[PDB]
């Protein structure tokens, strides 16, 4: 990694700009990287391209909550833990990755309300069953689900599924006066 890190180090010379306080974007796609050295020395990075690699986990974002958009697709990433301590993410690319501990992810995702977009095609959820409505029930605050915006049909059937008490509320508070029709 440090052998190729020179190009990132050269970025100040590439743009001819000032100093390390200028960190905003970082791109390392198509370099089969697996793990990154601890990025807690850098500065207010908000855009990150680390897709098209062989990344697995995160041991480098210890205080890199300053990120706002993260692009980690087409990898072998299995790690979403402690990321809740970095809740400033708004858009995330994650397609072709390995996330299966979905309830713990949601527990992490409960602190990641800031996310506006997320991509999940070819992720295990895209290949699962009872997937999209489960996510919507867990995440009403995420709009671009697989970047595909939610529709009212999915919301309706999700409401019918997940809260049976609320479903009978829907049937009863309107009228639900007699049973057989």
């Amino acid at each position: 990694l440090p052998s190729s890190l020179k190009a990132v180090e050269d970025q100040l010379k590439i743009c001819g700009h000032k100093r390390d306080i200028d960190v905003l974007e970082l791109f390392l796609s198509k370099k089969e990287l697996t793990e990154v050295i601890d990025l807690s020395r850098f500065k207010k990075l908000r855009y990150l391209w680390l897709h098209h690699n062989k990344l697995h986990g995160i041991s480098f974002l210890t205080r890199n909550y300053c990120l706002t958009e993260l692009y980690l697709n087409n990898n072998a990433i299995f790690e979403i833990e402690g990321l809740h301590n970095l809740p400033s993410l708004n858009i995330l690319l994650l397609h072709h990755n390995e996330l299966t501990n979905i309830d713990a992810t949601m527990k992490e995702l409960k602190g990641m309300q800031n996310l506006r977009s997320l991509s999940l095609y070819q992720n295990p959820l895209s290949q699962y069953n009872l997937y999209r409505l489960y996510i919507i029930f867990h995440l009403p605050g995420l709009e671009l689900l697989d970047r595909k915006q939610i529709t009212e049909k999915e919301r309706r059937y999700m409401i019918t599924i997940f809260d049976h008490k609320k479903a009978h509320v829907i049937q009863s508070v309107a009228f639900g006066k007699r049973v057989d029709a």
């Binding site: 590439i14 743009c15 700009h17 974007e25 791109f27 391209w49 970047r147 595909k148």
Partner: peptide, 29 residues
């Protein structure tokens, strides 16, 4: 949708291209 989705994927590819373009612009700056 199918067509839409695909077209949406193409739009995503185009946006990636534009992001690369912006990266190039920043490098130039």
């Amino acid at each position: 949708r199918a067509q839409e989705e695909m077209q949406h994927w193409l739009e995503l590819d185009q946006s990636r291209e534009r992001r690369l373009r912006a990266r190039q612009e920043a490098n130039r700056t």
